[PDB]
Amino acid sequence: AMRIGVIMGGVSSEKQVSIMTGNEMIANLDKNKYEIVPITLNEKMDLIEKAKDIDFALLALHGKYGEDGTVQGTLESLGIPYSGSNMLSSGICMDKNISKKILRYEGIETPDWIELTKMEDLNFDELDKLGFPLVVKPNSGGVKIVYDKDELISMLETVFEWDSEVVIEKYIKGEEITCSIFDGKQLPIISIRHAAEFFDYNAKYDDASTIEEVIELPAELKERVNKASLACYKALKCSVYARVDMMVKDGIPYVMEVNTLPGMTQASLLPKSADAAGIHYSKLLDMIIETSLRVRKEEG
Amino acid sequence: AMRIGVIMGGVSSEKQVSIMTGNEMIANLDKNKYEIVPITLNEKMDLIEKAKDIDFALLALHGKYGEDGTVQGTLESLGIPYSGSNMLSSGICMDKNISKKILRYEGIETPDWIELTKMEDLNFDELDKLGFPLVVKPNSGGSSVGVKIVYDKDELISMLETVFEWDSEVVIEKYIKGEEITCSIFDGKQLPIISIRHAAEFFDYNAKYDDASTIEEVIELPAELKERVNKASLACYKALKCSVYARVDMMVKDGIPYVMEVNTLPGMTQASLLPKSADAAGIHYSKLLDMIIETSLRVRKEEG
Helix, strand or coil: CEEEEEEECCCCHHHHHHHHHHHHHHCCCCCCCEEEEEEECCHHHHHHHHHHHCCCEECCCCCHHHHHHHHHHHHHHCCCHHHCCCHHHHHHHCHHHHHHHHHCCCCCCCCCCCECCCCCCHHHHHHHCCCCCCCEEEEECCCCCEECCHHHHHHHHHHHHHEEEEEEEEEECCCCEEEHHHHHHHHEEEEEECCCECCCCCEEEEEEEEEECCCCCCHHHHHHHHHHHHHHHCCCCCCCEEEEEEECCCEEEEEEECCCCCCCCCCCCHHHHHHHHHHHHHHHHHHHHHHHHHHHHHHH | CEEEEECCCCHHHHHHHHHHHHHHHHHHCCCCEEEEEEEECCCHHHHHHCCCCEEEEEEECCCCHHCCHHHHHHHHHHHEEECCCCHHHHHHHHHHHHHHHHHHHCCCCCEEEEEEECCCCCCCCCCCCCCCCEEEEECCCCCCCCEEEEHHHHHHHHHHHHCCCCCEEEEECCCCCCCEEEEEEECCCECEEEEEEECCEEEECCEEEEEECCCEEEECCCCCHHHHHHHHHHHHHHHHHCCEEEEEEEEEECCCCEEEEEEEECCCCCCCHHHHHHHHHCCCCHHHHHHHHHHHHHHHHCCC
């Protein structure tokens, strides 16, 4: 019976989110196919000791900790197969600037942009060429939209506090979607809506709250969406699964984000996207294991 | 004194190059500054234990083992500063196809290329837009299978089978006839440019003949070309996010430098190119090592 390590780790929030991911997996893995080995990482490199007996690492990780590529690099070196994209692909997909460069070279639609450095200053020369308004995002991955001349400036200050690196994009307003890819096949598309929500007990107001529905899109747009989301997957060297976040504007989808390590809880987008296609959660984990195994073998 | 791990590792040939590199550094590290500890990895992940007590990791690695970025991501995650570029920058520079896509985006001259995978069959029409003759290189590089020129379609088909057992991906470029040069960057400054020419060599005892014989010299380039080479070389270093040092290999044709290779982990023995170049600049070997340490510490600090 194949020993499946369920890998959890990170710090603070991400650790929480990782644990909640790991517990969902640990509960839904077929116990007849698998021997389940929950693994909780105190420190990242404690992974080598723990991984010493398991036959596969099913990554429950979330955030930079599972996206930077170290864990994948480490697992490769121990010769343990593991789920999801590899080190180079994880790393690239977590870098917004490098990602967009590889995307534009393929002529895949993504908003024009500019990169900004903590130490460096912005030559207004290249900046204002994309004009207004703008969105400022950290390069490694909140949102600040900037309408005016002075608008931009105020943000970089605090974004540079946190991220040594920032991307400034021209702001496209359109209809948001997310496209999960599993093993080169596009799963059902999900549309993301924003609606204001009031919480009486905490007395909280939120407009950033999300509503996600599976809606069949016009077959014309559905084609142009599936083309692009599979092109990203290919171009960024993703494997076994990925989530492409997109923005549709006047008929044309633009790539907003590429997630090599998307939410794996049952309310997460990719597990919903799959379920709509008739793949229930427990089987989803089977596919991730079997496709990951095959992919790792091709790699080496 | 700061404790400096000299990190050696790899398999087969690379590990020899590594041990050699690591022994030169050990012999030349300034012992008034540094308590010197050699570290020889039988397996890559032995690093976590073997590095527990060191203040800095000076990488003596060579080849993919120090290029793919596992070692850098590892040291990062342990909080031990290390020499040279970070995990992402190494990974990118080791990948020919991704590297060319990123340099091309900036309009840095590099020759046209096609990538082939062992799953996809190489349509010869997409490859005929290249034409002849062609250089075939494994996408992820390496010592094992080398870079090879192929003049016609048949010589190509062979060369593809030879590479594909060793590499999933292969990059195929227009060949450009020209003058070879190598440009070492140190901490964003250009060191003296090295010119490389070829001459056949006969070896009597082993009864061997080598027309692949290389001659490497530091010769002042005409001022214009030198300014054009120095612009391009630095733009490569910045575009691939390298740091503390890198070696950019270039082919000059009709006054135009083209990027052949970007190395985040070039040869560090005194007979290697980056050391010779630093030496032509009056930075001798022991000071080169201090510089790599000091600068790497500065960079790792900046990186959060």
